[model samples]
Target: GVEINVKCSGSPQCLKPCKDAGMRFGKCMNRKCHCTPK
Candidate 1:
């Protein structure tokens, strides 16, 4: 799924794994992280 279950503190740096995994972008959503495709 595009939504990651990993907890995030609303920090963009915390979403690095999503981009590192090849996703275009990532955002903090409800304390979790969501990834967008390129």
Candidate 2:
């Protein structure tokens, strides 16, 4: 049962991990974008 966390930018397609993980997209807060399995 492993999760995912990675930096991201650009379109929603960049949130690929969340899609495969059966979860929605995530953000990188006040910095950049962050793609994860959430």
Candidate 3:
């Protein structure tokens, strides 16, 4: 999966790793970084 298992704070910055991995966007899900293309 494109989701990062790292903890996230619900900030756009949480998407850093996801963006670097070529994802369109990412957000916090259960305090974890969940990445998605759409």
Candidate 4:
């Protein structure tokens, strides 16, 4: 976690905090580009 940056990459849990500041978060599933819904 650092200041002056967008919310595109970081800990998935950071979503909750980031969203408040108009940001986004995601988890990198290295299982062949897998994904999921919130």
lDDT of 3 by residue, 1-38 (tens): 76778777766767677767876867777756777875
Relative to the unseen true structure, what is the C-alpha lDDT of residue 1 in candidate 4, on a scale of 0 to 100?
22
Choose the strongest candidate by TM-score.
1
- Error of model 1, residue 29, in angstroms: 2.2
How close is every model to the real structure, measured as TM-score?
Answer: 0.58, 0.35, 0.57, 0.29
Q: Number of clashes in model 4? A: 0
Clashes of each: 0, 0, 0, 0
lDDT of each: 0.72, 0.50, 0.72, 0.38
Where model 3 places Cα greater than 4 Å from the true spot, the runs are none
lDDT-based ranking: 3, 1, 2, 4
Ranking by TM-score: 1, 3, 2, 4
RMSD of each: 2.0, 5.1, 2.2, 9.6
Q: lDDT (0-100) at residue 17 of candidate 4? A: 45
Q: Give per-residue lDDT, candidate 1, residue 20.
A: 67
In candidate 3, position 10 carries an lDDT of 62
TM-score of 1: 0.58
